[PDB]
Amino acid sequence: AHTVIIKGTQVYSPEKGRWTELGALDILQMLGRAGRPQYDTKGEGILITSHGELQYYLSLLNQQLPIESQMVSKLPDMLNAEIVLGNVQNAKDAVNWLGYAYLYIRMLRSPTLYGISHDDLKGDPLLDQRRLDLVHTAALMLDKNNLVKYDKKTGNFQVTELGRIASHYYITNDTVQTYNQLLKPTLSEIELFRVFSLSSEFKNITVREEEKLELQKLLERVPIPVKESIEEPSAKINVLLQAFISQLKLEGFALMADMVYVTQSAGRLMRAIFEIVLNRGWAQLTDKTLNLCKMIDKRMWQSMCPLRQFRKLPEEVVKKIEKKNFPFERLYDLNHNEIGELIRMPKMGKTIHKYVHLFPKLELSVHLQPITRSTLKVELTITPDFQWDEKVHGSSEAFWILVEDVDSEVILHHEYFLLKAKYAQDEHLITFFVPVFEPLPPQYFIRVVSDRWLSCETQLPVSFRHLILPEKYPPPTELLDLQPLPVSALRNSAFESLYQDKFPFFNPIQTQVFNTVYNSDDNVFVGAPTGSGKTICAEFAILRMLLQSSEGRCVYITPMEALAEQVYMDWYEKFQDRLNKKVVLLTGETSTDLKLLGKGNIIISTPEKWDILSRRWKQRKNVQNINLFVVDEVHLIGGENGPVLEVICSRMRYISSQIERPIRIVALSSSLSNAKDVAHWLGCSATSTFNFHPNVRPVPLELHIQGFNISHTQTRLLSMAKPVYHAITKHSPKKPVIVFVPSRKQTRLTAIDILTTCAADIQRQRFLHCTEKDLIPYLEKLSDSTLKETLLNGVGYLHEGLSPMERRLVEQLFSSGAIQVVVASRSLCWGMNVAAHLVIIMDTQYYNGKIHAYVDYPIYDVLQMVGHANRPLQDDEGRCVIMCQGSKKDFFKKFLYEPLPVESHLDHCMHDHFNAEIVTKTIENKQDAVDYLTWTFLYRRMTQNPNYYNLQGISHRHLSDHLSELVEQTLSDLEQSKCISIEDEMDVAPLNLGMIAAYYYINYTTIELFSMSLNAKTKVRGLIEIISNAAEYENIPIRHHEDNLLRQLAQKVPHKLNNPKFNDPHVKTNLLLQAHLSRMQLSAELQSDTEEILSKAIRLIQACVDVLSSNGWLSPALAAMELAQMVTQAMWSKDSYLKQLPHFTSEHIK
């Protein structure tokens, strides 16, 4: 406008609790509208204010008002935010951060106005003492308020839970101190308002006499009683908050301003109080605080109708629903006409039904399995029972899952649950561990409440009336203080020739178990932590097997293929080079497996490699005639690929009971709480079961768990990069460091992030213990340019995409001590031939794209990662920093120090074993199936943890009925798939499908689909889809950013896919098989999965040929035979027969 008139220049600011002058920004913005740029050639700005305030306006609008930093008022808040974010760790970091603020610049230019004399500037030109004094003064305020743990000795700052809440919610230090002193678990709704009204944000809010009468009318109408008086500021704040929630109409301008200011800061203050209460575990206070946060944001009481959250509904209809005081859940079961008739609003009945179904409502299912006597595994399935709406719900719905005891006062397990819009109408699996006390409560409360939606909470009482908790595990075998065992304790001189230069004395675990393993012939169970030398006990058993007869046959079973490769190399140079003993490694080929087993004295193989040979142990004499069966990592039977190991171990015990010569089973594994079941299942006695504790390792393990309360995985992964560098500098500045990454892509980012944190400080290239002259020979053989850039700085990286030469070179550089930090992927924990002093486990979870959820890492993988931080002679102790989310912090603390409870999972994957046993004639009837199942670990674990296997008791009728039902269910699945034939409902026989399934080691489901999906007119075009749909490809890795790449490969393959879903592993396998057949370029991550698919592709092709051979289809058999040849040659059937030859491009074909 041409003329602008600012009348009064006085605004009642609720923050100061009085009428203050207009701000500079408001005056400048108001004065900027004087004079239109189009028609006005000269503006006119009138500023009517007080005579004493005329100078401020003249200087502000005349370029005479200096910009002075006001950071002194909120110095502690800014310092707390930097400390919480990790930007500043000690006093020096805070001083450096303070130097980049406007206060430091203003303090140097104008020290007099900042409280600094000219003498101080002369004695400190850089202004370092003033920054230290300001940081110390700010740190004292933060330390006095319990915001940060600051010690005056070293100046280091420790981030506390209150500081994170205060920095996250912008709450002042005084407000945090008030919330800590006044925040109690027994605070009611009335006290919650008083605590909020006592915050430091409303310290200037005063109760004026001009509005006392109006406050009295609000005090008699507020639903929440106030123990304070009307003349106290706390009552006015509590009354203002209650009036805003109740929608009471105010009259005073000052009262309205105070209510708006109180309501605006109430949202952040309420969230901070809820976070503090939620962190403390107060279930009763958390529900009230969470309800209060939603009530303030929603501007409605919790007793009001839930339809008030949807602003599109009429108020008269909402009031009519409120007048008819009926339960909110009652409208869910009513139809559109019933809802309209119940409220007497037939016209709005359809809208009410649409609004009722659009409200968040999740159906909770509880699957509780007691892992231990004090720890229970709760698998909560959340099913969204509401129609998703972007205009009402948005991109995602935030919910909180709170686990509480019977009293509903202590939060056993609280975690955030983000319900994304793309993942609506689907069950979400939430797995967590809740503690169980000696006083077993009748039930637990699982409250899934919305984080923003009021009256949206689902309560699921997890009753423990029929919960049979496992019996208290026996104490682990104590490490007797025997004298160290010298090499002379062994008998054979040649046996001591392979350990003379290694160590003069054995470890205490080896000395205690050496007498039972080397000087004994009974089954020995050695439960010791990863790194105590369990392989030496197996070698003692191998030496015992080699002492009785020079032609012995020791069998070493490793749950991981990499462990067998590491053991095969270790065994080859020790058992073959120095003892002249045939040590061989089992392959995936059974044709060469029989020759290797018959010609080798030590047979190292995986559970899958030995299962194929052991399935026909009746015919194969080499499998039965075994003098020793070593099972390393027996604790792996409670995880993936564990049912095969349990079946192999059970088969080995059953074979040893009928061969006229027992097979000495040496079961080595981690320290397990339920070691009696493993010893009982493996035939180990009470004195031969060496089940130790995790704290008995030769190298003491210092395990530190850092909780990250970040729900998002990307933010949590990025926020832990700073902590990884801080943990390395605090735990091992000059020691090897191993960092575990959740994926192959995170290793490169983590390696650069550590370098970036190291480059931020003056300690550049501090992770390279050697010089660049000696790194040229190793850096020139690497293919990854980024690895050389990180390797030159002293920080290595490891992932599945790296070639073996690069992985071997990286391990060699780290083993020799040239490098200090190695960033290894989560999948490389088993395959790592090196150990560091400090082990970093950051983001202990993986993004499983099959279910679109962040699945936590298994305990076995974490145990191996923790075991990697074990230096026997070079390090006196071992550090392990486990950076994980706060929800899983309790799970790691229980399963890390205490023995690991292992439970067999053969009940879900017993179909393959049952078919193999039926084909071998081991199980000829239903009674034999139950008898065969009694030799496995599942039967032994069913009597100790019946609740884990859906059992109701340990009695014979319950155990016999459960085993019969499991046998009758697995047998029914085999009969329905045409794998076996059941005659008279009791006797089972092997069918054609079962023989093929158990011959090539194929899943029963794959054979059922092959037999029902293979016709007489099948071709190679449809053959790939049938092969790609086999159950063996369901374990393919689906990760983030893997759907876009597959889509690009779906338009280039020679075969189209009908209805291709990017989340289905079968589709990726078909695309990968087509890509391998066309020899097209693929990413490193895609090629890693292609090799895994190609490993089992040959067996599936052979099964298809066998299935077609029995079906009498010549055409389908020929296509399968051509596919098998084409799969090995990476060539297509539609192309010429010359692409198989190496170095032949399309030019030769043309």
Partner: protein
């Protein structure tokens, strides 16, 4: 009641009822030594005291079993809060007994109710209500059912349970005078039984499914012959938001509001 500000100060007093849960006294006198023994766990007693009212009497039906190889002692394992409204001297419980699948494994051991102040004798209203429950429900045995009175002594709580003698059951069944001194009321109508607290085991609570348990404010919605289902959940406080809907739902809607409010931008939200 005053119904204007009396409930406010009562809720303020009721907000501090957790201070009564550590000062708990059991009247260990006049126990005949020949009856059952009742073990009320401290967690459910604490919850019942917290959710109660200093003036209005609340009541919860007691359900429990006996410990193995010990039939002479009765471990109360459940307190069933039913939709009730109570005066300062009696509780108007619904005519329907608590029926649920979780109470089938247990037997009804009586009902627990709070008293505004300690009385050396069982209230005639309490014995009349108990005997009416006897006559209307055969599943309640007079030998095993008691009336735990959690009298609100100041700054503490005194618990005294009474067992109905056959004469007391007959008189209460035949009684219709709802006053404080009905005719034919004698101290022989009840006998004090043995009770004790326990940290060894924990009970639970049963709250109504469709509605809540406190019907004192909207007692016009409370009927003696009404029907209710149960829910394995924890009961709310006496002055909870859902228990007094008239204090939160009778507000006039914001019509032509916030039109002359204060202009303040929520910079953080």
């Amino acid at each position: 009641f005053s119904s204007k500000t009396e409930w406010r100060v009562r809720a303020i007093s009721a907000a501090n009822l957790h201070l009564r849960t550590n000062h708990i006294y059991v009247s260990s006198d006049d126990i005949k030594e020949t009856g059952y023994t009742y073990i009320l766990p401290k967690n459910v007693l604490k919850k019942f005291i917290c959710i109660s009212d200093l003036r209005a009497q609340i009541a919860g039906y007691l359900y429990g079993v006996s410990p193995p190889d010990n039939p002479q002692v009765k471990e109360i394992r459940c307190i069933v809060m039913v939709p009730q409204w109570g005066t300062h001297q009696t509780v108007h419980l619904p005519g329907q007994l608590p029926q649920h699948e979780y109470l089938k494994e247990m037997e009804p051991l009586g009902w627990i109710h709070t008293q505004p102040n300690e009385s050396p004798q069982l209230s005639p209203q309490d014995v009349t209500t108990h005997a009416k429950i006897m006559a209307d429900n055969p599943s309640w045995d007079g030998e095993k059912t008691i009336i735990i009175t959690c009298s609100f002594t100041p700054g503490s709580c005194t618990l005294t349970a009474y067992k109905l003698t056959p004469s007391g059951y007959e008189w209460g069944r035949q009684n219709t005078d709802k006053g404080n001194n009905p005719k034919g009321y004698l101290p022989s109508h009840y006998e004090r039984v043995q009770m004790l607290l326990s940290d060894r085991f924990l009970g639970f609570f049963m709250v109504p499914a469709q509605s809540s348990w406190n019907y004192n404010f909207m007692g016009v919605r409370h009927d003696p012959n009404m029907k209710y289902e149960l829910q394995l959940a924890n009961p709310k406080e006496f002055y909870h938001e859902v228990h007094r809907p008239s204090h939160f739902l009778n507000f006039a809607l914001l019509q032509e509001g916030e039109v002359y409010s204060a202009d303040r931008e929520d910079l953080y939200a």
